[PDB]
Amino acid sequence: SGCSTVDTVKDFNKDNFFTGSWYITHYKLGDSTLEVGDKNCTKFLHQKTADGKIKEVFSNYNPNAKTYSYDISFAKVSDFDGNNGKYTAKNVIVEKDGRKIDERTLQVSYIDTDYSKYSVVHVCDPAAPDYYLYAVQSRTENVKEDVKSKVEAALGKVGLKLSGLFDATTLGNKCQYDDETLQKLLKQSFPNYEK
Ligand SMILES: NCCc1c[nH]c2ccccc12
């Protein structure tokens, strides 16, 4: 039952983490074998402002269907678990123009990160525990060769191996990212969630 609890990064430096963008390079979604509809290229853009708001905008592109989906996580600094890389966010699935399609609560747990290259995350919805995500994330489109070992270890903690995830860098050539929508939605106002 429920979302798994996983150990997370101690002394999480929010300032150094929530800036710039991330590419999702590898991931396991749920228990069943992955269908092509859930094989995507995801890039996200995020920020922490002085008011203490954290905002994270995702572009998810499915090469098989050649379609995009977008979602946004909203959180506040006081939603974090002390000094650890663990927090709850309201995540809103939205149209390109920001119109709300659906919303959910996501418990986020950062297993590890070096801030400037890679992070390893577990994301889960308490209302839909069957939807859980283990993700490898990079500051570049591919994982830097010199941190592969660090990523492998992090996945070790949670009973996983890289070759055990879907490698999104296999989509590779067909991958694309809606950078302009990312930038636009990040700056756009959402008074219903930014409160
Ligand atoms: N965009 C919804 C799932 C997701 C992927 N990576 C994340 C990092 C933090 C929060 C959610 C996520």
PDB file of C-alpha atoms and ligand atoms in Angstrom:
ATOM      1  CA  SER A   1       0.000   0.000   0.000  1.00  0.00           C
ATOM      2  CA  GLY A   2       0.920   3.656  -0.502  1.00  0.00           C
ATOM      3  CA  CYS A   3       4.033   5.377  -1.816  1.00  0.00           C
ATOM      4  CA  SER A   4       7.386   3.880  -0.851  1.00  0.00           C
ATOM      5  CA  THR A   5       9.493   5.834   1.625  1.00  0.00           C
ATOM      6  CA  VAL A   6      13.080   6.304   0.471  1.00  0.00           C
ATOM      7  CA  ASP A   7      16.139   7.836   2.133  1.00  0.00           C
ATOM      8  CA  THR A   8      17.041  11.244   0.683  1.00  0.00           C
ATOM      9  CA  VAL A   9      19.951  13.692   0.364  1.00  0.00           C
ATOM     10  CA  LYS A  10      21.059  15.303   3.622  1.00  0.00           C
ATOM     11  CA  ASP A  11      21.712  19.051   3.706  1.00  0.00           C
ATOM     12  CA  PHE A  12      19.814  19.842   0.495  1.00  0.00           C
ATOM     13  CA  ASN A  13      21.058  23.082  -1.074  1.00  0.00           C
ATOM     14  CA  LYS A  14      17.881  24.479  -2.617  1.00  0.00           C
ATOM     15  CA  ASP A  15      19.581  27.536  -4.105  1.00  0.00           C
ATOM     16  CA  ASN A  16      22.018  25.360  -6.078  1.00  0.00           C
ATOM     17  CA  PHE A  17      19.401  22.827  -7.125  1.00  0.00           C
ATOM     18  CA  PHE A  18      16.330  24.795  -8.185  1.00  0.00           C
ATOM     19  CA  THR A  19      17.965  26.777 -10.979  1.00  0.00           C
ATOM     20  CA  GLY A  20      18.393  26.144 -14.689  1.00  0.00           C
ATOM     21  CA  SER A  21      17.005  22.923 -16.144  1.00  0.00           C
ATOM     22  CA  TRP A  22      17.131  19.105 -16.117  1.00  0.00           C
ATOM     23  CA  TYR A  23      16.801  16.328 -18.687  1.00  0.00           C
ATOM     24  CA  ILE A  24      15.197  13.025 -17.699  1.00  0.00           C
ATOM     25  CA  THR A  25      17.543  10.454 -19.194  1.00  0.00           C
ATOM     26  CA  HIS A  26      16.416   7.154 -17.638  1.00  0.00           C
ATOM     27  CA  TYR A  27      13.387   6.062 -15.652  1.00  0.00           C
ATOM     28  CA  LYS A  28      11.103   3.347 -14.366  1.00  0.00           C
ATOM     29  CA  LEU A  29       7.419   4.199 -14.314  1.00  0.00           C
ATOM     30  CA  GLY A  30       5.285   1.751 -12.289  1.00  0.00           C
ATOM     31  CA  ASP A  31       5.460  -2.062 -12.126  1.00  0.00           C
ATOM     32  CA  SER A  32       4.178  -3.060 -15.591  1.00  0.00           C
ATOM     33  CA  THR A  33       6.308  -3.093 -18.749  1.00  0.00           C
ATOM     34  CA  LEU A  34       6.490   0.330 -20.417  1.00  0.00           C
ATOM     35  CA  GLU A  35       4.092   1.099 -23.303  1.00  0.00           C
ATOM     36  CA  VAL A  36       5.247   3.384 -26.116  1.00  0.00           C
ATOM     37  CA  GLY A  37       2.793   6.064 -24.940  1.00  0.00           C
ATOM     38  CA  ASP A  38       4.854   6.409 -21.764  1.00  0.00           C
ATOM     39  CA  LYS A  39       8.190   6.546 -23.562  1.00  0.00           C
ATOM     40  CA  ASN A  40       8.965  10.291 -23.498  1.00  0.00           C
ATOM     41  CA  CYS A  41      11.683  12.958 -23.713  1.00  0.00           C
ATOM     42  CA  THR A  42      11.274  15.228 -20.715  1.00  0.00           C
ATOM     43  CA  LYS A  43      13.039  18.495 -19.983  1.00  0.00           C
ATOM     44  CA  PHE A  44      12.099  20.732 -17.101  1.00  0.00           C
ATOM     45  CA  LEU A  45      12.846  24.274 -16.019  1.00  0.00           C
ATOM     46  CA  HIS A  46      12.684  25.458 -12.442  1.00  0.00           C
ATOM     47  CA  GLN A  47      13.258  28.325 -10.035  1.00  0.00           C
ATOM     48  CA  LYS A  48      13.136  29.350  -6.405  1.00  0.00           C
ATOM     49  CA  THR A  49      12.180  33.001  -5.851  1.00  0.00           C
ATOM     50  CA  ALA A  50      12.772  35.194  -2.807  1.00  0.00           C
ATOM     51  CA  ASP A  51       9.157  34.842  -1.701  1.00  0.00           C
ATOM     52  CA  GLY A  52      10.149  31.211  -1.123  1.00  0.00           C
ATOM     53  CA  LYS A  53       8.112  29.752  -3.986  1.00  0.00           C
ATOM     54  CA  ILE A  54       9.485  26.857  -6.022  1.00  0.00           C
ATOM     55  CA  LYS A  55       8.108  26.399  -9.522  1.00  0.00           C
ATOM     56  CA  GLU A  56       8.904  23.568 -11.922  1.00  0.00           C
ATOM     57  CA  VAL A  57       7.698  23.404 -15.515  1.00  0.00           C
ATOM     58  CA  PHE A  58       7.844  20.161 -17.501  1.00  0.00           C
ATOM     59  CA  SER A  59       7.816  19.572 -21.251  1.00  0.00           C
ATOM     60  CA  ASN A  60       7.056  15.924 -22.059  1.00  0.00           C
ATOM     61  CA  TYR A  61       7.445  14.932 -25.684  1.00  0.00           C
ATOM     62  CA  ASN A  62       6.296  11.570 -27.077  1.00  0.00           C
ATOM     63  CA  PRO A  63       8.154  10.813 -30.356  1.00  0.00           C
ATOM     64  CA  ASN A  64       5.821   7.958 -31.376  1.00  0.00           C
ATOM     65  CA  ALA A  65       2.802  10.282 -31.326  1.00  0.00           C
ATOM     66  CA  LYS A  66       4.832  13.448 -31.923  1.00  0.00           C
ATOM     67  CA  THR A  67       2.946  15.185 -29.146  1.00  0.00           C
ATOM     68  CA  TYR A  68       3.716  17.262 -26.083  1.00  0.00           C
ATOM     69  CA  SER A  69       2.240  17.241 -22.630  1.00  0.00           C
ATOM     70  CA  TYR A  70       2.977  19.838 -19.963  1.00  0.00           C
ATOM     71  CA  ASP A  71       2.785  19.949 -16.169  1.00  0.00           C
ATOM     72  CA  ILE A  72       3.890  22.272 -13.390  1.00  0.00           C
ATOM     73  CA  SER A  73       4.930  21.653  -9.814  1.00  0.00           C
ATOM     74  CA  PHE A  74       4.290  24.352  -7.233  1.00  0.00           C
ATOM     75  CA  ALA A  75       5.851  24.195  -3.777  1.00  0.00           C
ATOM     76  CA  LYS A  76       7.150  26.389  -0.992  1.00  0.00           C
ATOM     77  CA  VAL A  77      10.301  26.172   1.099  1.00  0.00           C
ATOM     78  CA  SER A  78       8.166  25.248   4.114  1.00  0.00           C
ATOM     79  CA  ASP A  79       7.015  22.107   2.266  1.00  0.00           C
ATOM     80  CA  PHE A  80      10.488  20.592   2.626  1.00  0.00           C
ATOM     81  CA  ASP A  81      11.472  18.044   5.246  1.00  0.00           C
ATOM     82  CA  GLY A  82      14.017  19.902   7.350  1.00  0.00           C
ATOM     83  CA  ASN A  83      17.381  19.901   5.597  1.00  0.00           C
ATOM     84  CA  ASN A  84      16.666  16.880   3.390  1.00  0.00           C
ATOM     85  CA  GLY A  85      15.953  16.641  -0.320  1.00  0.00           C
ATOM     86  CA  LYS A  86      12.321  15.768   0.296  1.00  0.00           C
ATOM     87  CA  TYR A  87       9.136  17.728  -0.258  1.00  0.00           C
ATOM     88  CA  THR A  88       5.522  17.689  -1.325  1.00  0.00           C
ATOM     89  CA  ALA A  89       4.283  19.594  -4.353  1.00  0.00           C
ATOM     90  CA  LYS A  90       0.983  20.310  -6.021  1.00  0.00           C
ATOM     91  CA  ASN A  91       1.434  19.217  -9.627  1.00  0.00           C
ATOM     92  CA  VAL A  92      -0.909  20.543 -12.280  1.00  0.00           C
ATOM     93  CA  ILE A  93      -1.280  19.002 -15.729  1.00  0.00           C
ATOM     94  CA  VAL A  94      -1.831  21.910 -18.112  1.00  0.00           C
ATOM     95  CA  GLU A  95      -2.427  22.877 -21.730  1.00  0.00           C
ATOM     96  CA  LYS A  96       0.296  24.741 -23.615  1.00  0.00           C
ATOM     97  CA  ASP A  97      -1.320  28.018 -22.541  1.00  0.00           C
ATOM     98  CA  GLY A  98      -1.436  27.002 -18.868  1.00  0.00           C
ATOM     99  CA  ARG A  99      -5.121  26.039 -18.669  1.00  0.00           C
ATOM    100  CA  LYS A 100      -5.586  23.353 -16.002  1.00  0.00           C
ATOM    101  CA  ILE A 101      -6.414  19.847 -17.236  1.00  0.00           C
ATOM    102  CA  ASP A 102      -5.935  18.021 -13.898  1.00  0.00           C
ATOM    103  CA  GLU A 103      -4.046  18.296 -10.591  1.00  0.00           C
ATOM    104  CA  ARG A 104      -2.469  15.983  -8.009  1.00  0.00           C
ATOM    105  CA  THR A 105      -0.183  15.841  -5.001  1.00  0.00           C
ATOM    106  CA  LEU A 106       3.331  14.475  -5.522  1.00  0.00           C
ATOM    107  CA  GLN A 107       5.737  13.361  -2.813  1.00  0.00           C
ATOM    108  CA  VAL A 108       9.259  14.014  -4.082  1.00  0.00           C
ATOM    109  CA  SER A 109      12.366  12.328  -2.685  1.00  0.00           C
ATOM    110  CA  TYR A 110      15.844  13.113  -3.968  1.00  0.00           C
ATOM    111  CA  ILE A 111      17.985  10.035  -3.435  1.00  0.00           C
ATOM    112  CA  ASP A 112      21.172  11.801  -4.573  1.00  0.00           C
ATOM    113  CA  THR A 113      22.544  14.740  -6.595  1.00  0.00           C
ATOM    114  CA  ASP A 114      25.751  16.665  -7.239  1.00  0.00           C
ATOM    115  CA  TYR A 115      23.703  19.715  -8.254  1.00  0.00           C
ATOM    116  CA  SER A 116      25.655  20.534 -11.436  1.00  0.00           C
ATOM    117  CA  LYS A 117      25.438  17.212 -13.305  1.00  0.00           C
ATOM    118  CA  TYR A 118      22.957  14.608 -12.068  1.00  0.00           C
ATOM    119  CA  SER A 119      20.136  13.875  -9.661  1.00  0.00           C
ATOM    120  CA  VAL A 120      18.226  10.703  -8.841  1.00  0.00           C
ATOM    121  CA  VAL A 121      14.621  11.002  -7.752  1.00  0.00           C
ATOM    122  CA  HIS A 122      11.591   9.050  -6.589  1.00  0.00           C
ATOM    123  CA  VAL A 123       8.216  10.653  -7.322  1.00  0.00           C
ATOM    124  CA  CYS A 124       4.891   9.257  -6.173  1.00  0.00           C
ATOM    125  CA  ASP A 125       1.224  10.201  -5.897  1.00  0.00           C
ATOM    126  CA  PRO A 126      -0.472   9.164  -2.620  1.00  0.00           C
ATOM    127  CA  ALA A 127      -3.781   9.012  -4.494  1.00  0.00           C
ATOM    128  CA  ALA A 128      -2.245   6.890  -7.254  1.00  0.00           C
ATOM    129  CA  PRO A 129       0.597   4.847  -5.686  1.00  0.00           C
ATOM    130  CA  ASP A 130       0.557   2.509  -8.693  1.00  0.00           C
ATOM    131  CA  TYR A 131       1.966   5.537 -10.489  1.00  0.00           C
ATOM    132  CA  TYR A 132       5.449   5.775  -9.076  1.00  0.00           C
ATOM    133  CA  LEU A 133       8.510   7.084 -10.815  1.00  0.00           C
ATOM    134  CA  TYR A 134      12.201   6.456 -10.350  1.00  0.00           C
ATOM    135  CA  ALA A 135      14.156   8.883 -12.529  1.00  0.00           C
ATOM    136  CA  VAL A 136      17.738   9.655 -13.483  1.00  0.00           C
ATOM    137  CA  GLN A 137      18.169  13.333 -14.371  1.00  0.00           C
ATOM    138  CA  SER A 138      21.021  15.228 -16.016  1.00  0.00           C
ATOM    139  CA  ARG A 139      21.979  18.850 -16.645  1.00  0.00           C
ATOM    140  CA  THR A 140      22.756  17.677 -20.182  1.00  0.00           C
ATOM    141  CA  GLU A 141      20.836  15.424 -22.581  1.00  0.00           C
ATOM    142  CA  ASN A 142      23.065  12.454 -21.704  1.00  0.00           C
ATOM    143  CA  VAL A 143      24.559  11.417 -18.369  1.00  0.00           C
ATOM    144  CA  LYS A 144      28.151  12.645 -18.110  1.00  0.00           C
ATOM    145  CA  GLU A 145      30.401   9.598 -18.434  1.00  0.00           C
ATOM    146  CA  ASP A 146      32.360  10.485 -15.276  1.00  0.00           C
ATOM    147  CA  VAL A 147      29.296  10.341 -12.998  1.00  0.00           C
ATOM    148  CA  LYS A 148      27.805   7.090 -14.295  1.00  0.00           C
ATOM    149  CA  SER A 149      29.190   5.256 -11.249  1.00  0.00           C
ATOM    150  CA  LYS A 150      27.650   7.748  -8.811  1.00  0.00           C
ATOM    151  CA  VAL A 151      24.257   7.290 -10.500  1.00  0.00           C
ATOM    152  CA  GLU A 152      24.575   3.499 -10.423  1.00  0.00           C
ATOM    153  CA  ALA A 153      25.224   3.591  -6.686  1.00  0.00           C
ATOM    154  CA  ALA A 154      22.295   5.903  -5.996  1.00  0.00           C
ATOM    155  CA  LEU A 155      20.017   3.500  -7.886  1.00  0.00           C
ATOM    156  CA  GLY A 156      21.584   0.760  -5.777  1.00  0.00           C
ATOM    157  CA  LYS A 157      20.091   2.165  -2.587  1.00  0.00           C
ATOM    158  CA  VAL A 158      16.610   1.612  -4.012  1.00  0.00           C
ATOM    159  CA  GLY A 159      17.083  -1.853  -5.484  1.00  0.00           C
ATOM    160  CA  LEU A 160      17.609  -0.684  -9.050  1.00  0.00           C
ATOM    161  CA  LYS A 161      20.179  -0.857 -11.831  1.00  0.00           C
ATOM    162  CA  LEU A 162      20.544   1.575 -14.725  1.00  0.00           C
ATOM    163  CA  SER A 163      19.967  -1.225 -17.256  1.00  0.00           C
ATOM    164  CA  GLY A 164      16.772  -1.808 -15.269  1.00  0.00           C
ATOM    165  CA  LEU A 165      15.267   1.508 -16.393  1.00  0.00           C
ATOM    166  CA  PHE A 166      13.946   2.669 -19.729  1.00  0.00           C
ATOM    167  CA  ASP A 167      16.823   4.542 -21.397  1.00  0.00           C
ATOM    168  CA  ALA A 168      15.191   7.627 -22.894  1.00  0.00           C
ATOM    169  CA  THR A 169      18.444   8.404 -24.709  1.00  0.00           C
ATOM    170  CA  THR A 170      17.398   5.597 -27.075  1.00  0.00           C
ATOM    171  CA  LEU A 171      14.677   7.834 -28.466  1.00  0.00           C
ATOM    172  CA  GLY A 172      17.648  10.148 -28.980  1.00  0.00           C
ATOM    173  CA  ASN A 173      17.449  11.495 -32.527  1.00  0.00           C
ATOM    174  CA  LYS A 174      13.700  12.076 -32.383  1.00  0.00           C
ATOM    175  CA  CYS A 175      13.799  13.924 -29.054  1.00  0.00           C
ATOM    176  CA  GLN A 176      12.569  17.475 -28.724  1.00  0.00           C
ATOM    177  CA  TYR A 177      11.781  19.955 -25.973  1.00  0.00           C
ATOM    178  CA  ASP A 178       9.383  22.907 -25.951  1.00  0.00           C
ATOM    179  CA  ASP A 179      11.834  25.468 -24.559  1.00  0.00           C
ATOM    180  CA  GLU A 180       9.631  28.422 -25.472  1.00  0.00           C
ATOM    181  CA  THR A 181       6.620  27.017 -23.612  1.00  0.00           C
ATOM    182  CA  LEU A 182       8.870  26.159 -20.686  1.00  0.00           C
ATOM    183  CA  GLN A 183      10.094  29.767 -20.414  1.00  0.00           C
ATOM    184  CA  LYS A 184       6.609  31.207 -20.974  1.00  0.00           C
ATOM    185  CA  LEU A 185       4.818  29.059 -18.378  1.00  0.00           C
ATOM    186  CA  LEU A 186       7.574  29.640 -15.832  1.00  0.00           C
ATOM    187  CA  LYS A 187       6.945  33.391 -15.991  1.00  0.00           C
ATOM    188  CA  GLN A 188       3.141  33.097 -16.322  1.00  0.00           C
ATOM    189  CA  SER A 189       0.981  33.829 -13.266  1.00  0.00           C
ATOM    190  CA  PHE A 190      -1.093  31.043 -11.672  1.00  0.00           C
ATOM    191  CA  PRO A 191      -2.988  32.679  -8.799  1.00  0.00           C
ATOM    192  CA  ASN A 192      -4.880  29.460  -7.998  1.00  0.00           C
ATOM    193  CA  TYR A 193      -1.720  27.521  -7.101  1.00  0.00           C
ATOM    194  CA  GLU A 194       0.699  30.333  -6.278  1.00  0.00           C
ATOM    195  CA  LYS A 195      -0.909  30.820  -2.885  1.00  0.00           C
TER     196      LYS A 195
HETATM  197  N1  LIG B   1       6.612  16.007 -14.064  1.00  0.00           N
HETATM  198  C1  LIG B   1       6.041  14.980 -13.226  1.00  0.00           C
HETATM  199  C2  LIG B   1       6.959  13.897 -12.754  1.00  0.00           C
HETATM  200  C3  LIG B   1       8.363  14.277 -12.402  1.00  0.00           C
HETATM  201  C4  LIG B   1       9.511  13.942 -13.106  1.00  0.00           C
HETATM  202  N2  LIG B   1      10.586  14.452 -12.469  1.00  0.00           N
HETATM  203  C5  LIG B   1      10.170  15.139 -11.348  1.00  0.00           C
HETATM  204  C6  LIG B   1      10.891  15.862 -10.358  1.00  0.00           C
HETATM  205  C7  LIG B   1      10.211  16.464  -9.303  1.00  0.00           C
HETATM  206  C8  LIG B   1       8.819  16.365  -9.233  1.00  0.00           C
HETATM  207  C9  LIG B   1       8.110  15.661 -10.213  1.00  0.00           C
HETATM  208  C10 LIG B   1       8.803  15.043 -11.279  1.00  0.00           C
END
